[PDB]
Amino acid sequence: GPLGSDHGETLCGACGDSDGADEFWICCDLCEKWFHGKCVKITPARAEHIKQYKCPSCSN
């Protein structure tokens, strides 16, 4: 694995990893954090019916 990081990175709010190739992402509209679709178990197909995504942390 590569050492260091890209300063213009976006870290997933669940796994804390950087964005990679051909990955589906979704952003919470309340805290503006980004998440892997795989990490929050949300497919692109499901996200199409989501008007305003609210991450698990903001859903408490």
Partner: peptide, 9 residues
């Protein structure tokens, strides 16, 4: 929802 799909290599 605010989503995004990243490109391939």
């Amino acid at each position: 929802a605010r989503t995004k799909q990243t490109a391939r290599k």
